[PDB]
């Protein structure tokens, strides 16, 4: 079942281009897309996410779209320039200039060609599975264009799966691009409607490791985006390899979402900084190795994947463990803890796990936005570049919606906090 | 470590239990004496859970056989699986004469008696490393498997408050008219301790188990051996994710949280593929089947809005996974299976390879038509009780001599249960 990857602006295609940069390593794949001497045969799947042109030449089927030509122009200057299909790549001459509403607007009026790549993409597809989107939710390009196309592909392939790594901004970056907090709205309500599954990525929290557990003073975008990879690279695993029949995308998503409109997910990583599975399961909780900075909040559910040599009798130990123990879950069903164990690719420089966890207290972002959003709409703050857009033109009422619509999620995540969450 | 113990009562719980063991020893290449095959591999599988080694190097039961009568214990004991069992896990009291196929006289007799069966069920609970939970075995329409059934699941609630307890429960024949009069009585009061004092209930119907019996392999008035061989199979099949290695998700604790993520609507139904040429059986055959009224071993009525909650297929042969993940795939794009408006579809497939010593698969499945069985209970038990009819040896018991509120309470904790199925049939099961 393949899936397609759809990177949008600056920060969706510098974060593709890391992730297919690790699959590549992963999968034995060179650089121009040519299997390595070594990687003949394997335990991989590379089916799901690349094409395979020859016997021995991969694709990834992945969309590059921007309204900006610099991101795109550094990718094809790249050692990676002939990985991508050319004609996968879109670029706009008309940008987005850090407004939603230009992004949207773009999106409508490159919309044909936008969906011819599409469009050929999925009926170049046996059985689609679903989309992934990478992109940022405050930019002008991953918010108002991913917007767009989160609402298109709701409309267009209806049955098709959306999955987003959704990169939410640092404080720095709120502090230096003032319309922020509109934009972070309007794109949370097409991730809130529009979405089956959203991985949160956080700059605060990101930018915080990378300082304090791996000693970088003043990182760069290239620095935290190897934090990214990582966790792309790992939460595709059970989807890149046999075997994992539970944990398709659909097996994936029923079992760390049973409720449906909570589908923002936190992620775990250790070792960030003699390890057995109890060790790396009990750092995998620990808030320190918890990627998005955030009693009463709980856990709906856990999945690690666990990568490395791991005694198996010792799973059930960890698991139990934490069920009778530092793991706090709703108590209005059991405590849903999923292990998949993995091994680290051969073709790589040791044991790890990645945390996949939907929590509550994911909210107390979504409620962070929804008051920055406020201190400016309440005062009509910094909307003239909305204005002069088609959306806004005549109101502000497609902003006052979305803000209700994340309400109505913050609202229920609180409820699923208590034991009324269900009336029996 | 993770051991499960296993608790025999009555007629029906110990004839099932016996052939759970039996079946168990087959497979796991021990003998009737518990002597492993001399070339076994280790680590091949998971006996542990099941057995403990005995002083002499000899596979013994985690099991604990208990009966108001002698009979089938007997049996047990003059069988060449004598030897298999540990003797100190036997106790049949026989003071107050059986339980005369009545709920109350087995109930009263479990407070008699509490002490020694403890002994026994402590010390097994005690000899774990880390033990999972209970297994109960036993009818729902008897005295013994009934009445201390349900003795022993209160206590088990109050005495190893942490432990999961999953049963195994045989349901009565419906489509018939039985010798115990108080059929309903008998199996309202044991639901009631089903409802609130189990984690995870996997319901036995003998009116589809007969079913197939008399329908397919035409036997008429069939024997319990005969229904107990298809019991067997299931119960068998039902416990592959627990005695072998690879199935992390799947342990007891594991099992229960994915089948059962709505805590009280934990009654689950079994189907079996094949329970009786030119082209192989493939996957998507035995998942398809699966999934079949009639290898689903309840009778629910044939037609509405009842629906899946969740599905696990175990499938036992000779396949890759990729096989069973495009028949997965298949299934789900089919539309085969009706499931609940305010999640999504829980399909689970665990794989496995049958025991060294033909594609075949289980079902186990939470789905909401389950109630139409306790339903039929309330039905029958509503009418006796406006008739009056059958009280007089439930009166001459403690729980009964002044009045019948123990019933009343029962009939309205079963009510509650069957209204919150309907309600998961809805939407506004969650009110977002
Ligand atoms: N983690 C990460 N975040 C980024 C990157 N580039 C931009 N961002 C975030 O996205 C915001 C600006 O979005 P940008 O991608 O430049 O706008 P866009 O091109 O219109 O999507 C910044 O304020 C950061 O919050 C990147 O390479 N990595
Ligand atoms: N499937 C099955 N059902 C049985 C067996 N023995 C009795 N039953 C059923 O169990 C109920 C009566 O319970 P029974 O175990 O005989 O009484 P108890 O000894 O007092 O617990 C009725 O529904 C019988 O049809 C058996 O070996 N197999």
């Not at 030509?69 to 001459?93: D, G, M, T």
């Not at 959203?198 to 934090?227: C, E, G, K």
């Not at 002069?388 to 006052?400: G, L, S």
Request: glycine content about 6%; aromatic content about 8%.
């Amino acid at each position: 079942r393949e899936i397609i990857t759809l990177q949008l602006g600056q920060c969706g295609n510098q974060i593709g281009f890391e992730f297919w940069k690790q699959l590549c390593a992963e999968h034995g794949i060179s650089p121009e897309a040519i299997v390595e001497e070594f990687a003949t045969e394997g335990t991989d799947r590379k089916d799901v996410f690349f094409y395979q042109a020859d016997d021995e030449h991969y694709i990834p089927r992945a969309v590059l779209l921007d309204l900006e030509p610099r991101v795109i122009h550094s990718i094809l200057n790249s050692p990676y320039a002939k990985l991508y299909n050319p004609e996968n790549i879109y670029l706009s001459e008309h940008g987005a200039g850090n407004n939603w509403a230009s992004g949207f607007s773009q999106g409508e009026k490159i919309h044909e060609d936008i969906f011819d790549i599409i469009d050929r993409e999925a009926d170049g597809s046996d059985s689609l599975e679903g989309f992934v989107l990478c992109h940022s939710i405050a930019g002008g390009t991953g918010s108002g264009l991913g917007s767009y196309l989160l609402e298109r592909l709701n409309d267009r392939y209806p049955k098709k799966l959306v999955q987003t790594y959704s990169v939410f901004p640092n404080q720095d970056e709120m502090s230096d691009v003032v319309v922020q907090p509109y934009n972070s709205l309007l794109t949370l309500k097409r991730l809130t409607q529009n979405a089956d599954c959203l991985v949160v990525l956080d700059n605060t929290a990101l930018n915080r490791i990378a300082t304090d557990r791996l000693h970088i003073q003043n990182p760069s975008f290239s620095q935290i985006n190897q934090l990214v990879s990582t966790i792309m690279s790992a939460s595709t695993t059970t989807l890149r390899y046999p075997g994992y029949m539970n944990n398709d995308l659909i097996g994936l998503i029923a079992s760390l979402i049973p409720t449906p409109r909570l589908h923002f997910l936190m992620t775990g990583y250790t070792p960030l900084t003699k390890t057995t599975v109890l060790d790396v399961m009990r750092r995998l909780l620990q808030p320190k190795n918890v990627m998005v900075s955030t009693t009463n909040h709980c856990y709906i559910a856990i999945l690690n994947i666990i990568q490395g040599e791991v005694d198996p009798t010792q799973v059930h130990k960890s698991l139990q463990r934490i069920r009778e123990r530092l793991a706090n879950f709703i108590p209005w069903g059991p405590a849903s803890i999923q292990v998949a164990l993995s091994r680290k690719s051969p073709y790589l420089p040791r044991v790890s796990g990645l945390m996949m966890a939907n929590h509550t207290s994911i909210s107390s972002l979504f409620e962070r936005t929804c008051r920055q959003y406020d201190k400016l709409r309440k005062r009509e703050a910094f909307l003239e570049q909305f204005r002069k857009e088609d959306m806004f033109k005549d109101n502000f009422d497609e902003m006052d919606t979305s803000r209700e619509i994340v309400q109505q999620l913050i609202d229920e995540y609180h409820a699923a906090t208590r034991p009324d969450y269900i009336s029996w």
